[PDB]
Ligand SMILES: Nc1ncnc2c1ncn2[C@@H]1O[C@H](COP(=O)(O)OP(=O)(O)NP(=O)(O)O)[C@@H](O)[C@H]1O
């Protein structure tokens with residue numbers, strides 16, 4: 001084996017002499033600068049990069065990659081020995097734990113207690129990432145790189161590093177460094193005075209003196225497309241500690257550098273985990289309307305309705321007499337009609353959204369669920385956005401009541417263990433439904449065709465029947481497009497809706513009077529020709545205010561009401 | 577390799593017709609069904625779009641008919657002459673058994689998933705006999721698998737999207753047991769119109785009692801019952817416990833690599849013919865058809881033409897392939 005003293009001096013030489021042609025080629029010696037910041041307590045963790053080491057000594061890099069734990073300890077001791085040379089300044093007292101250390105120094109006048117920094121390796125660029133299936137037992141103890149998806153994360157917990165006790169009789173203190181996942185505490189004083197006199201003094205543990213570190217537990221899983229044919233995906237446990245905590249999130253793609261090790265017992269076969277050293281994450285109105293689903297011919301005003309669904313209205317909030325701004329709409333489709341393309345286009349387009357289907361498949365439902373913590377739910381995962389329901393007509397009573405509760409309160413409840421937990425569901429709803437049998441029949445009402453109950457079905461601001469039928473030129477055009485596809489700016493739109501949705505336009509009393517006259521005349525025609533109700537008025541308000549938000553204007557105007565009126569009026573024509 | 581090369585190079589006859597004729601020699605008749613089953617064995621091809629969407633390459637087939645018309649035997653034959661094939665019956669299986677079930681490991685003590693029938697058939701075929709006797713709750717499980725080739729599971733601490741890419745071949749019997757001539761196809765068939773829209777082709781089979789046909793059928797059956805294997809002697813009984821089959825397996829196995837491509841003429845033909853077919857369907861009525869014709873018909877035509885080109889090992893999809901494909905679907909949809 002190597003002489004680790006010689007290796008220590010080599011590591012010191014690297015820290016003392018290396019410059020990356022750094023600070024725009026001024027050769028300011030990056031690690032020397034870092035040691036100054038560390039000495040003056042400006043910074044806690046230090047990521048040493050193995051590509052830098054490779055410039056001087058590739059054999060050292062190879063030495064590190066196998067049995068990495070030795071070199072972790074070695075580099076940490078080297079940094080502690082060199083730190084006073086880069087100090088020039090006295091640091092202000094800022095921590096109770098360090099106030100105890102200061103008192104200890106004042107009274108005196110192990111190193112692990114004082115070592116307030118963290119040292120980690122950034123993997124060499126030679127090492128391509130392995131999949132969770134290729135980290136076999138020949139890699140125990142070696143530095144590895146892995147790629148996958150996060151599934152679960154715990155809260156941050158305090159992990160014990162060194163314990164500090166005080167003695168009732170002799171007034172001394174004792175220390176106990178911790179390394180294994182468990183330990184056994186001290187009881188009676190080992191100091192010479194107490195021992196020689198057998199005076200029996202007891203030891204009291206001090207949470208004001210002992211040292212703790214931030215600790216968090218995580219799980220990571222294989223990508224589905226990487227799994228070989230006819231197999232179930234696997235998972236690996238990752239332990240996060242120190243300044244690496246709170247980076248990762250559930251459902252997020254990550255690449256992790258770490259050491260692969262076996263778990264300590266308390267048989268010859270043992271479980272393993274990955275010790276993390278670094279975590280890396282992987283006019284305007286007509287133009288925007290024409291930008292929605294250009295693959296689909298016609299349906300000009302339906303695209304504008306979906307645009308305003310994405311833009312939204314305003315929450316009025318007059319002292320609890322609430323009117324909400326979220327638009328909600330529903331599409332009734334004939335069998336096999338083009339609605340799937342439009343639906344998926346809005347799903348793809350929207351910056352925050354989710355999709356589900358009403359049949360109640362083997363996966364998790366519309367609401368959250370429990371496993372052995374709470375998780376999931378399409379209604380939950382779309383929150384500051386829009387959620388889309390497919391084949392709505394096949395929903396169950398549980399689904400209908402869940403949608404009803406979301407429409408009223410925009411929140412849900414699921415019982416973890418009998419406790420009445422409750423959970424945010426702030427999103428807008430988009431529904432897709434199909435008639436009970438065959439094509440829609442114009443001789444019968446929409447309730448008779450689609451057969452959802454009228455109470456919740458009438459919640460939607462707009463209802464559209466997507467009916468279509470053969471024609472030679474249109475079918476030929478469609479076939480030409482599909483066969484052509486088989487043979488051979490969203491950023492601006494997102495920024496536009498980002499800036500324009502800052503507006504919350506009001507209405508003046510003149511517009512309220514105008515709306516009053518228009519609404520009563522509309523209801524007169526509605527009963528003379530009924531479906532009209534207060535919901536209709538609030539829908540008009542929502543769509544007109546949404547259009548006012550689409551403009552860069554601080555108030556609604558006559559044209560906004562007129563546009564909303566023709567949109568709600570003409571929607572009936574789709575049913576006939 | 578040389579045998580398959582010289583055989584395909586001959587080009588004297590339509591090879592696909594010879595291979596289809598030679599399928600399942602014991603079973604007499606049913607030409608179009610044999611041709612469709614051969615297309616299921618060869619398969620289409622996948623394609624992906626720059627928006628992240630993709631086109632399904634595998635084919636699904638359904639058979640409906642009277643008693644004693646050899647529906648079950650065709651399923652038991654495909655199961656023996658295809659790689660990675662699985663059997664299932666409607667009354668004997670559960671949705672959990674079809675997808676995945678939680679298991680307690682006795683070696684480690686841990687809880688983990690175990691694959692069901694449709695997962696094990698990944699990149700293969702699954703045969704469902706007696707399909708009309710399933711509870712609808714199981715059909716809800718089958719829906720996601722047949723549409724998207726994936727199955728979503730949320731059990732034993734795992735939330736996962738498993739792979740279950742497979743072709744479904746299914747058989748059923750009509751309502752009232754014997755098919756009724758005085759009722760429409762949609763009345764005789766017991767299934768929901770939503771589910772019936774997922775299969776690529778649906779065939780109806782009937783025991784038409786013509787003496788002219790009974791003559792050859794009965795003769796063929798009786799010839800089959802007098803055979804004895806050459807390795808067996810005159811009076812023995814067994815203990816309890818045209819293309820050759822070997823060449824057929826090898827030719828199909830090589831043909832599964834070719835990945836042929838569309839041509840402008842075939843695309844033009846399919847588009848024009850689909851428009852013509854749509855106009856004819858618009859004129860026609862539900863009293864004369866099994867189901868409506870839509871974009872799924874174009875996908876079916878493309879898959880079938882691709883498979884026929886694949887059988888030729890011609891790198892192009894040709895006019896001959898498109899013409900064959902449209903004739904097949906025309907027979908399936910527009911015959912009484
Ligand atoms: N054309 C045929 N060629 C060979 N055998 C045939 C033919 N037609 C019927 N059979 C016989 O029919 C018998 C029953 O076959 P089977 O596949 O069960 O029919 P089926 O249509 O599935 N009827 P069922 O299972 O009651 O719905 C077999 O023993 C075959 O020998």
Ligand SMILES: [Mg+2]
Nearest residue numbers: 646647648649
């Ligand atoms: Mg049978």
Ligand SMILES: [Zn+2]
Nearest residue numbers: 167170189194
């Ligand atoms: Zn003491």
